[PDB]
């Protein structure tokens, strides 16, 4: 359509192509080597944080979390830590 687009379509120069489209592939993990090693490359970050014993969001989920299977006087007090529910958190 445009003149600039059309003169290089008729010309003999090759088009400055870029095979960049990798749909559906997630961002590979860098940073903490422990979680990278235990990071499933196919699962979503909400699934992988849960599988790894980490909270993706400490704040309320604004939606409907997946159901894969049919699942069956204090200001001075301190919360005595939280035991790790997974080995990887213990790592």
């Amino acid at each position: 359509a445009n003149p600039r687009q059309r003169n290089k379509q008729r010309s003999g120069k090759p088009r400055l192509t870029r095979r960049n489209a990798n749909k559906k592939a997630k961002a590979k993990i860098y940073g903490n080597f422990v979680i990278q090693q235990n990071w499933d490359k196919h699962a979503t970050l909400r699934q992988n944080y849960a599988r790894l014993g980490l909270l993706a969001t400490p704040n309320y989920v604004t939606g409907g979390v997946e159901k894969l299977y049919p699942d069956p006087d204090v200001l001075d007090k301190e919360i005595s830590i939280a035991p790790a529910k997974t080995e990887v958190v213990r790592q």
Binding site: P3, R6, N7, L16
Partner: protein
């Protein structure tokens, strides 16, 4: 006769008595790009020439405008 060749635009529209080109508003710096002449822009824009330089920066952006010699 009332128009000669314009040295900047190259189209025979250079008034003698007015000493001004109508096709491109010679000899002023900023050219005559009037919006309502839409068809006039698509006649007189980038890509109607060669863009010999701009076709070099487009290619050189891929590798990051690098320079030097290969090892």
């Amino acid at each position: 006769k009332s128009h000669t060749i314009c040295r900047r635009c190259g189209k025979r529209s250079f008034h003698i008595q007015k000493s001004t080109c109508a096709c491109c508003g010679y000899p002023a710096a900023k050219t005559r790009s009037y919006n309502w002449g839409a068809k006039a822009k698509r006649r007189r824009t980038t890509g109607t020439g060669r863009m010999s330089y701009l076709k070099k920066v487009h290619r050189s952006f891929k590798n990051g405008f690098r320079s030097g010699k290969p090892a």
